[PDB]
Amino acid sequence: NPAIKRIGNHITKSPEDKREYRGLELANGIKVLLISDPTTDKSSAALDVHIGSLSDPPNIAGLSHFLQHMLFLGTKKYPKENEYSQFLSEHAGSSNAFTSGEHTNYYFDVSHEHLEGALDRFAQFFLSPLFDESAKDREVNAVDSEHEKNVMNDAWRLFQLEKATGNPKHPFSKFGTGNKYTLETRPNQEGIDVRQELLKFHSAYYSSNLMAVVVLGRESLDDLTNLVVKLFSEVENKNVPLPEFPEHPFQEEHLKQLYKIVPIKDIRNLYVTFPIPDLQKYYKSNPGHYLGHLIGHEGPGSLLSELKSKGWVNTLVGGQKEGARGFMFFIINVDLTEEGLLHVEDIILHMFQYIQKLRAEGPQEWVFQELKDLNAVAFRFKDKERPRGYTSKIAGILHYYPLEEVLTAEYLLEEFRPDLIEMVLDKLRPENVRVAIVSKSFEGKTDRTEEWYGTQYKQEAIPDEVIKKWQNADLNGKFKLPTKNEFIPTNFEILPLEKEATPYPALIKDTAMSKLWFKQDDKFFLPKANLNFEFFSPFAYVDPLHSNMAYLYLELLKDSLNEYAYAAELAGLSYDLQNTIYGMYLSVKGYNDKQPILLKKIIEKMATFEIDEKRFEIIKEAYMRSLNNFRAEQPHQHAMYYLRLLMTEVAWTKDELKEALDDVTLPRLKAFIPQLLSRLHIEALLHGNITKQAALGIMQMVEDTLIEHAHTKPLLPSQLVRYREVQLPDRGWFVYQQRNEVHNNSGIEIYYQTDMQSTSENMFLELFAQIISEPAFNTLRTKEQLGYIVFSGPRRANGIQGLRFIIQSEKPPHYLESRVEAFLITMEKSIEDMTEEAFQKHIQALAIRRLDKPKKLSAESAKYWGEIISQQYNFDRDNTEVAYLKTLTKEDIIKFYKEMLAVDAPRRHKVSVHVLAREMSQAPALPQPEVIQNMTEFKRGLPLFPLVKPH
Ligand SMILES: [Zn+2]
Numbered sequence: 001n002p003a004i005k006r007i008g009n010h011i012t013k014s015p016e017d018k019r020e021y022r023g024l025e026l027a028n029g030i031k032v033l034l035i036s037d038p039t040t041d042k043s044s045a046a047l048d049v050h051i052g053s054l055s056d057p058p059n060i061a062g063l064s065h066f067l068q069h070m071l072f073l074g075t076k077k078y079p080k081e082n083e084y085s086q087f088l089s090e091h092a093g094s095s096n097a098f099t100s101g102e103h104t105n106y107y108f109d110v111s112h113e114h115l116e117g118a119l120d121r122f123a124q125f126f127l128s129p130l131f132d133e134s135a136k137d138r139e140v141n142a143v144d145s146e147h148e149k150n151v152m153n154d155a156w157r158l159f160q161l162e163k164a165t166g167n168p169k170h171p172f173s174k175f176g177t178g179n180k181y182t183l184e185t186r187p188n189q190e191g192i193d194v195r196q197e198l199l200k201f202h203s204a205y206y207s208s209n210l211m212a213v214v215v216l217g218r219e220s221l222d223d224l225t226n227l228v229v230k231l232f233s234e235v236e237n238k239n240v241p242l243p244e245f246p247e248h249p250f251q252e253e254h255l256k257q258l259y260k261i262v263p264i265k266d267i268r269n270l271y272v273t274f275p276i277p278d279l280q281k282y283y284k285s286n287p288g289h290y291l292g293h294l295i296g297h298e299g300p301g302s303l304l305s306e307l308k309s310k311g312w313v314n315t316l317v318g319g320q321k322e323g324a325r326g327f328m329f330f331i332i333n334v335d336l337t338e339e340g341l342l343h344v345e346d347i348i349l350h351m352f353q354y355i356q357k358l359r360a361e362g363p364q365e366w367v368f369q370e371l372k373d374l375n376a377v378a379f380r381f382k383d384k385e386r387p388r389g390y391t392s393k394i395a396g397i398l399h400y401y402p403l404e405e406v407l408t409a410e411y412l413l414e415e416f417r418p419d420l421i422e423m424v425l426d427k428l429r430p431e432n433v434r435v436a437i438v439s440k441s442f443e444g445k446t447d448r449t450e451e452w453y454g455t456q457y458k459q460e461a462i463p464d465e466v467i468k469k470w471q472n473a474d475l476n477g478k479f480k481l482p483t484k485n486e487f488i489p490t491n492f493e494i495l496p497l498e499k500e501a502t503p504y505p506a507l508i509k510d511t512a513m514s515k516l517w518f519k520q521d522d523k524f525f526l527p528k529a530n531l532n533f534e535f536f537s538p539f540a541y542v543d544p545l546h547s548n549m550a551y552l553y554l555e556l557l558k559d560s561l562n563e564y565a566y567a568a569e570l571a572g573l574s575y576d577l578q579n580t581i582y583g584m585y586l587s588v589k590g591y592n593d594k595q596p597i598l599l600k601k602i603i604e605k606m607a608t609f610e611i612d613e614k615r616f617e618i619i620k621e622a623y624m625r626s627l628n629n630f631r632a633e634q635p636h637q638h639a640m641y642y643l644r645l646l647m648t649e650v651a652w653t654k655d656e657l658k659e660a661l662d663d664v665t666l667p668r669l670k671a672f673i674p675q676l677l678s679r680l681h682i683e684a685l686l687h688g689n690i691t692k693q694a695a696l697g698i699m700q701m702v703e704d705t706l707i708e709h710a711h712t713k714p715l716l717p718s719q720l721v722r723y724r725e726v727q728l729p730d731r732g733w734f735v736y737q738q739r740n741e742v743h744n745n746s747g748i749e750i751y752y753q754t755d756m757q758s759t760s761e762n763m764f765l766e767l768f769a770q771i772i773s774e775p776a777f778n779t780l781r782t783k784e785q786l787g788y789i790v791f792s793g794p795r796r797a798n799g800i801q802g803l804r805f806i807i808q809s810e811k812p813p814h815y816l817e818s819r820v821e822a823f824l825i826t827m828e829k830s831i832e833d834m835t836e837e838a839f840q841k842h843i844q845a846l847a848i849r850r851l852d853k854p855k856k857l858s859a860e861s862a863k864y865w866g867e868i869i870s871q872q873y874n875f876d877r878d879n880t881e882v883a884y885l886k887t888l889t890k891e892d893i894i895k896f897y898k899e900m901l902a903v904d905a906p907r908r909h910k911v912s913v914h915v916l917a918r919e920m921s922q923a924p925a926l927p928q929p930e931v932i933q934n935m936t937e938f939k940r941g942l943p944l945f946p947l948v949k950p951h
Contacts (some may be wrong), residue, residue, distance in 0.1 A: 032398075266625045341439055
């Protein structure tokens with residue numbers, strides 16, 4: 001009554017949504033939404049503060065980002081640093097946060113039982129954080145490492161370069177991430193106490209009038225309402241005026257500019273930008289969504305289609321980009337072919353010709369109506385989100401929409417306002433444009449460097465006579481509006497559940513040609529289906545040349561199918577087609593109504609495909625770069641890759657693929673396809689709103705189309721080989737070493753192979769991984785500050801398993817190696833002394849994690865699909881393994897550690913991948929390792945495991 005100041009009438013929800021909701025506004029100022037899902041397996045909460053990096057003090061970059069790392073490391077009520085992240089891992093929860101221009105968003109999940117405890121430790125973040133002084137000095141490295149990781153990333157360099165080329169006076173130009181220089185080194189010199197400024201900032205800006213909160217749990221709406229006022233009405237209201245940025249960072253002198261930028265990767269893009277007013281207030285019209293939908297269209301007669309036909313671009317992104325309260329952007333972005341790079345002036349002329357077509361036709365109401373009705377259906381039949389992401393998302397939009405309209409806001413449109421559409425289109429003119437070109441061909445032709453990333457670039461005014469030519473853009477007869485979307489689903493009838501329906505997928509077809517798994521959706525009752533198909537052919541991956549052609553084949557298919565499939569995707573019917581090391585994979589997801597039509601179109605195109613010579617030469621060139629560009633990926637992911645290579649029977653390197661790519665010629669590909677298609681086996685999972693006989697009907701048309709157009713015949717049982725994992729010797733230690741030529745950081749992966757997956761070995765590892773998970777992050781990242789990325793947990797490949805550690809660091813790996821090793825003895829000593837109640841707490845956290853129910857169809861499909869592709873077929877895996885997990889004693893875990901994982905275990909199987917940077921508590925003594933010189937020699941030098949036996 002007293003701490004609450006207003007109560008949500010009905011929160012308009014989707015008719016299918018079975019959770020219940022209540023909006024609140026506390027006397028506080030805080031806007032709240034509560035979600036009662038009596039069935040939820042995990043409770044969650046999020047809090048969004050409408051302040052962010054855009055409000056960082058000019059002389060301390062990344063203060064608010066640094067503040068958000070800091071809130072995690074202890075408060076008054078709970079003073080031990082990791083009490084937060086520890087509580088969560090012992091009760092099956094996880095937590096995370098992000099910082100943007102105007103928001104700082106914090107969120108967690110946890111067992112539906114331990115919501116009150118978890119929410120308490122979370123609420124403290126906003127009442128009285130410690131900002132411990134020693135914790136300040138450590139966690140600044142984490143932020144510094146977070147930046148280090150991005151320095152060599154092209155998307156970030158570009159992100160910050162935009163800001164470095166607008167008004168320097170505007171808060172837009174601020175460096176939002178911060179690093180050790182700005183957060184520590186600069187301020188110590190300038191005589192600034194950072195902890196003070198952290199505290200000064202928290203109190204000045206972390207005010208309740210600027211906070212939204214979302215809590216979801218099993219507890220009822222009354223219980224929850226009490227729980228939040230208990231914990232949050234005690235937050236002070238300093239009545240902080242919400243920052244507004246009415247002036248655009250792009251003024252008169254910032255338009256008609258051209259930017260020539262050197263990338264890190266070999267990529268060619270064109271970025272076209274128009275400054276615009278904050279469209280946020282017109283949300284129910286979305287004039288920007290309407291113009292983006294058209295400019296961004298990929299169907300017949302679209303801007304993309306003509307630009308692709310000219311052979312200039314491959315992909316196009318168009319529409320409205322957020323800025324802040326008071327300013328926004330409209331963008332049209334394209335990648336460029338070699339030809340395209342030479343023809344930028346023309347590409348842009350085409351852009352303006354398409355905009356001209358829109359001017360000369362004026363707003364199309366049927367288009368708006370089509371988008372409204374699609375949204376209507378989308379919203380009606382939306383999948384039940386996971387709590388963590390849902391609370392977070394909502395907590396964010398509570399700042400933009402009255403409490404009743406939050407669930408519908410970012411979905412439903414209402415008034416077609418043709419006048420605003422005209423108002424926005426009017427801003428998309430040549431005199432209003434900033435143009436940026438990214439290409440390796442500007443290497444050493446640039447004369448500017450951007451401070452924070454070191455991005456090489458050049459700034460030119462666009463010649464007036466060029467602006468003038470674009471202003472006179474006439475009508476190009478190749479640009480038509482889209483036609484009515486004929487993929488819109490109309491039939492949403494959920495078919496009655498069948499008499500012979502199974503809880504798990506039943507094997508309903510078992511020929512030499514087809515293995516079909518089927519389950520009629522029994523949990524969700526949405527008019528959708530997931531249709532998955534693995535096709536096996538030995539010719540898919542027989543050698544690098546063939547691997548290359550497999551890839552290109554499917555890439556060219558999707559390219560030619562794209563015009564057709566775009567409309568389908570917009571209507572919530574999508575597909576996924578890609579080559580695998582055993583063949584191809586295809587999945588059709590979405591509304592079941594028109595699924596047959598698209599699927600058959602795909603198999604038809606697949607089996608009768610006619611290559612276009614120009615498309616072939618263009619995609620090939622892009623794949624060439626794509627392969628080369630791996631050198632500019634991150635050390636930690638180089639490490640992961642190298643080891644994937646070392647540990648798999650057959651694996652082709654990127655160099656091997658790159659070299660063999662020069663030999664893929666047009667005819668050699670035409671020949672390849674019928675060869676690939678002639679002998680197949682198809683394993684499938686069809687899962688959703690379909691009957692067991694519509695399923696058989698699906699398989700039959702898939703087969704029938706293949707037999708009929710590609711003369712496909714069955715494979716032999718003996719041809720269906722899976723790959724084995726390299727089998728490491730007891731007491732052996734191997735190191736493969738390589739350098740990353742792009743990042744000045746190192747990566748590492750450490751792998752302790754245990755044994756073949758079996759209920760027992762599976763759960764020994766999974767329990768240990770659980771017990772060590774949290775301490776691992778806290779010791780190596782939080783205490784020792786080795787790097788922003790520190791990972792651990794299970795590794796599962798080709799039926800085998802083991803423990804892994806991934807670290808990316810400033811330190812060299814030979815060192816990171818001893819520190820992980822140092823951590824391991826510590827976890828032993830810490831399990832010896834570990835209390836019997838702490839043990840069951842963990843066993844329980846694994847339990848809830850594994851027995852976590854799927855929220856949507858796809859999560860369920862993925863669980864079964866994992867079981868099918870891995871050829872283990874254990875669909876009731878969770879139950880038996882969790883049931884077996886519970887019987888596990890504390891000394892089982894110790895026996896298992898002692899025998900497999902310990903430094904002097906009789907059966908220790910260690911491989912390490914050390915990726916060196918661009919320029920290169922007591923730890924135990926380690927053996928001299930055997931240094932892998934050759935990946936092939938190494939693989940040949942030892943045995944290969946069996947393959948798993950199919951349950
Ligand atoms: Zn961060």
